[PDB]
Design a protein around this nucleic acid. Structure first.
Lengths: 96, 151, 127, 98, 206, 79, 114
RNA sequence: CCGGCCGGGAACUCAAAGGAGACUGCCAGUGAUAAACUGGAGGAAGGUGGGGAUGACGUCAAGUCAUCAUGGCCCUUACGACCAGGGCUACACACGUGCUACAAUGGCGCAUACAAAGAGAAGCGACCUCGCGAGAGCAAGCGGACCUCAUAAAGUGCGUCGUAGUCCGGAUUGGAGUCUGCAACUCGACUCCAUGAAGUCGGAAUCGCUAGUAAUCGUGGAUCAGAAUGCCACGGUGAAUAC
RNA sequence: AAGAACCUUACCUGGUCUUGACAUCCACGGAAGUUUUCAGAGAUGAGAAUGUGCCUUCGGGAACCGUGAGACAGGUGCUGC
């Protein structure tokens, strides 16, 4: 399921991290004035998916938008399943 | 507390006079866990009540407390017609505690602005037997004599 | 022995260099009267400081580490208890009878899932 | 002066590895400072158990990263020769400074 | 619906962690997904070899994978050709140099993964669930475990109303954490629905 | 409330607005991007904000400079 | 000191009457407080003409009084004349600064009307 | 350098590994010569020490085919898929949760204290300078008991406010820094300067809590370019009453 | 929902489908890619410049790209009774 969003997220990851993140960053620091504007116009003429704003950081085995955790890299249900099965090293239930 | 009642905690004495009674007055009067403000208002009121009364702090508190202690107090036991109030003798801790509670509300009901000053005012009122805490005591006693049920 | 700071209460640990002399409390090379000498509730934290009744001839420099003020007072008190048993063991029984050798293990209960506080539950709608 | 920061998820692996390094320095015969413990990083994750609806019933997980630093006084060439796969435990990550 | 995963409640106490490595916050998810792609591939590739447990250890340069199997011969193949092709594909999934060890699972009926996939295979082959569960508990009680609980669930025997039928022998103390219970599930993809099999096996109190 | 490094304008709108000013004979300009601050070059033009399938035409004046294009344009309806 | 308003200091602070006059804020009040540097809780007898002139020039240098009604009036009026909805939605009186009015914003909407 | 800062020391707080201790163990009474109950000595802890994780056979054909997988059915030049924009943010009213309060046990102004937990590599950002300010530029130390986030907040010592709609804070378009520049109009917050409404402690009813709990006071996390008074943790003072 | 300005994100306008945004083959051509112009709200096109390196027992094999028919996709569509 939700393969459209999978390839959309792959699209904005490859458009942000690979084609750009140097051109966008240089245009951003040109845009903040250091002592109509060319940097604002050229950052518009860059594609919108290049912006790191666009990426919704999403689950790797399923694709749930929510309950994603960056450290484990999967959805909440999937980190429960791998934790209870022992795939995640050091993950034990907390009881303090 | 169906199984077992729990005994009350041992109460520290107050630092100035060594009185668990004055400490219980402090603990009753505090709000939002503010012991510093509570005991400062207590000391200011005890100083003003003592200088107006001409006796010591603990003795003025004792006479005022003795006037706010009730002797008889009703309790809803519903012995007549499933709604009745029965007068029962009140144990000395509940006498002193009801005295302190009726005092601290009588302070709150008094219209003076600073609570140390009105706290000394109805302490002086109880020492002369005319404040609204002793009004509550008279209402409780009149309700006991009104609905006398058992000895 | 040199009578020193021992013991814990809430989140504190005592570092008092209590020593024979006239007791005037100095904190971080600065006076009680400069820090909070005329503060109200200083007296009722200083009363457990005195409550071991070996403060009558003992000068106090107090730099108890960590935690809140009443817990710091309990740490100081517990330290004078443990140091006085280190001095002589006949007065252990009287501090036990008064109840000062007991550490008060009461501590903050933890927050809990589906609840605002340690015990405090959401206001429940019957409907 | 050799500053070795070894970190793992299990304290038994940590103690085995730090005893091995202490054994290596003891085998070469140098003054060894004791392995000090550095504080455990309890990274807590609070994760929903129910796929669809819950707020009150939820379970909490922890990763515990342990840390010791050995801080041996004297390193030597025999230990540098004997370092090659001396640790040999997959659970432990070892960090080195001069 | 309301019972804890036994391996999760015994993970630091009795049962060992399945994957053992240390990665930082920047590489942990990337290693975890690499482990999942290796594990998924080797499971779907040697489900016919009856693998029980896969432990993956990364020393952060290489990968060492141990496959706990009842039948080591089909996992090895001939001359290690199958396991060397496995080693190569594990190397390109992990992206780092690889190594495979084969640890054997003696007494396959005492391993819960093997019993779960055995009952799953029979349920795909339309053997009856009651015979599968009685066979499992009888074989474990013969082979020497202290107890076994077999839960089968859902669409049993082609009925429209799903039901959960549990068969229990011996002692299965789930609430006691000092006990070792290996619990593993399997999923049979039948014609009318999917039949899920859960087995607990109790071997002792550690 | 918004940035001072540069007043933002959409580049397609800037090109079409300067072309409309240079020609002097233009129809309404249809623009879907509603998030542009009005330049003083825009005065003397109707620039159409996107609302619905329907049309909202705005004749921008001397006062409506600092405001964005969609303030004058209603997206929702009510009684 | 009455300038362009209805309020007057009376044995009290200039700043409360000044902020009661619309068209300003309280940074004028804080600035007059910093310019005087004296206790304004004292009696307003011998009210200083220096205070009156500094009050006047501070009001004149900053946004003068009476401009709030001016701003709301031109806002509603120019968008009502031009036919656009920005001044119409200010006439309707519900919050458009970004606020929820589903059950809140009773300060705008007044008493609740069943 | 009167900063442990510097030699030293490991004596203590600590940090974190392994043990010990708390078992009705001892004594007395009650009880059947049992279980147990009630007190006492010892002791930091006393009789589940506190809290947590742990949710039995089952029940509601409770929830999820929107996490996934999956049987049957349907769309498949659309019921797939991309972009701009919009909606999820509206509003006659009604309740459910929480926040700010109606002040004087409180504000407001000067000075002075005492924590814990956590995070950090496109990340945390000191010191200095410029700004009323949000922040800007220069920018060390840092993949961590160092460095940074981060001189907590109630507590205060003196004053002043002694009906004040009070710093209790509501209210469109501005005057602004900052985030991403698809872009702060429909739509973020922030000292915002924007006119200081209401509420002078609240009817029938109703809810949460037996001890560090209630109440109050502040702090950090996760989601995350930003966007909490919600959720997930942490500390301070500290109740009252159980007949 | 542990993050609604776009994204997320399904409901309103333009653009596209026998390989679709997304994998597998069968057939043909081209390295992959980098930098630009113009139209347009824009994945959409229409054009330009440099890279045929990686190699095949070269009877040419690459991760790949573009296109064509078929199988095939795909669905946050319905039934948790």
């Amino acid at each position: 399921a939700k393969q459209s969003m999978k390839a959309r997220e792959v699209k904005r990851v490859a458009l942000a991290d690979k084609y750009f993140a140097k051109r966008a960053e240089l245009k951003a620091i040109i845009s903040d004035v250091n002592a109509r504007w060319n940097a604002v116009l050229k950052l518009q003429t860059l594609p919108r998916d290049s912006s790191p704003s666009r990426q919704r950081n999403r689950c790797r085995q399923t694709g749930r938008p929510h309950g994603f955790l960056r450290k484990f890299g999967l959805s909440r249900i999937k980190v429960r399943e791998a934790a209870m099965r022992g795939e995640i090293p050091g993950l034990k239930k907390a009881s303090w | 507390p169906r199984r077992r009642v729990i005994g009350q905690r041992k109460i520290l004495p107050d630092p100035k006079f060594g009185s668990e009674l004055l400490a219980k007055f402090v603990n009753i009067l505090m709000v939002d866990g503010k012991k510093s403000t509570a005991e400062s208002i207590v000391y200011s009121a005890l100083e003003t009540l003592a200088q107006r009364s001409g006796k010591s702090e603990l003795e003025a508190f004792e006479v005022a407390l003795e006037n706010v202690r009730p002797t008889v107090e009703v309790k809803s036991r519903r012995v007549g017609g499933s709604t009745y109030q029965v007068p029962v003798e009140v144990r000395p801790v509940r006498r002193n505690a009801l005295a302190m509670r009726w005092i601290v509300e009588a302070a709150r009901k008094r219209g003076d602005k600073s609570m140390a000053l009105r706290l000394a005012n109805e302490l002086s009122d109880a020492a002369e037997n005319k404040g609204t805490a002793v009004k509550k005591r008279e209402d409780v006693h009149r309700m006991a004599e009104a609905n006398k049920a058992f000895a | 022995n040199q009578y020193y700071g021992t013991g814990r209460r809430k989140s504190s640990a005592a570092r008092v260099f209590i020593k024979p002399g006239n007791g005037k409390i100095v904190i971080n090379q600065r006076s009680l009267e400069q820090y909070f000498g005329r503060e109200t509730a200083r007296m009722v934290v200083r009363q457990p400081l005195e409550l071991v009744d070996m403060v009558e001839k003992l000068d106090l420099y107090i730099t108890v580490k960590g935690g809140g003020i009443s817990g710091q007072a309990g740490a100081i008190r517990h330290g004078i208890t443990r140091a006085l048993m280190e001095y002589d063991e006949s007065l252990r029984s009287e501090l036990r009878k008064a109840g000062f050798v007991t550490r008060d293990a009461r501590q903050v209960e933890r927050k809990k899932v589906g609840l605002r506080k340690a015990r405090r539950r959401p206001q429940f709608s019957k409907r | 002066r050799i500053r070795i920061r070894l970190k793992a998820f299990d304290h038994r692996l940590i103690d085995q590895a730090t005893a091995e390094i202490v054994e290596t320095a003891k085998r070469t015969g140098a003054q060894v400072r004791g392995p000090i413990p550095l504080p455990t990083r309890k990274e807590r994750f609070t994760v929903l158990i129910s796929p669809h609806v819950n707020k009150d019933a939820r379970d909490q997980y922890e990763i515990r990263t342990h840390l010791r630093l050995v801080d041996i006084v004297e390193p030597t060439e025999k230990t540098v020769d004997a370092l090659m796969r001396l640790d040999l435990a997959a659970g432990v990550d070892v960090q080195i400074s001069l | 619906g309301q019972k804890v995963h036994p391996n999760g409640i015994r993970l630091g106490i009795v049962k060992p962690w399945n994957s053992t490595w240390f990665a930082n916050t920047k590489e942990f998810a990337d290693n975890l997904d690499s482990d999942f792609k290796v594990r998924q591939y080797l499971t779907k590739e040697l489900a016919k070899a009856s693998v029980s447990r896969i432990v993956i250890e990364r020393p952060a340069k290489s990968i060492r994978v141990t496959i706990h199997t009842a039948r080591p011969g089909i996992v090895i193949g001939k001359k290690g050709e199958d396991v060397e092709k496995l080693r190569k594909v594990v190397a390109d999934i992990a992206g780092v140099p690889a190594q495979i060890n084969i640890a054997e699972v003696r007494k396959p009926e005492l391993d819960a993964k093997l019993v779960a996939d055995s009952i799953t295979s029979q349920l795909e082959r339309r053997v009856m669930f009651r015979r599968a569960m009685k066979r499992a508990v009888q074989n474990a009680m013969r082979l020497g475990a202290k107890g076994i609980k077999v839960e089968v669930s859902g669409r049993l025997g082609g009925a429209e109303i799903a039901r959960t039928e549990w068969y229990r022998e011996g002692r299965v103390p789930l609430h006691t954490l000092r006990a070792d219970i290996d619990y593993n599930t399997s999923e049979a993809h039948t014609t009318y629905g999917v039949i899920g099999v859960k087995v607990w096996i109790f071997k002792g109190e550690i | 409330r918004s940035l001072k490094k540069g007043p933002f304008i959409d580049l397609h709108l800037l090109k079409k607005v300067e072309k409309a000013v240079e020609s002097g004979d233009k129809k309404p300009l249809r623009t879907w991007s509603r998030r542009s601050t009005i330049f003083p070059n825009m005065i003397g033009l109707t620039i159409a904000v996107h609302n619905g399938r329907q049309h909202v035409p705005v004749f921008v004046t001397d006062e409506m400079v600092g405001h964005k294009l969609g303030e004058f344009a209603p997206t929702r309806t009510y009684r | 000191a009455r300038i362009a308003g209805i309020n007057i200091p009376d044995h009290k602070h200039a700043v409360i009457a000044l902020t009661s006059i619309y068209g300003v804020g309280k940074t004028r009040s804080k600035a007059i407080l910093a310019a005087a540097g004296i206790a304004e809780d004292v009696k307003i007898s011998e009210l200083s003409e220096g205070q009156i002139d500094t009050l006047r020039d501070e009001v004149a240098k900053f946004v003068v009084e009476g401009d709030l009604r001016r701003e709301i009036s031109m806002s509603i009026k120019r968008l009502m004349d031009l036919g656009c909805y920005r001044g119409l939605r200010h006439r309707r009186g519900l919050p458009v600064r970004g606020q929820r009015t589903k059950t809140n914003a009773r300060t705008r909407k007044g008493p609740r009307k069943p």
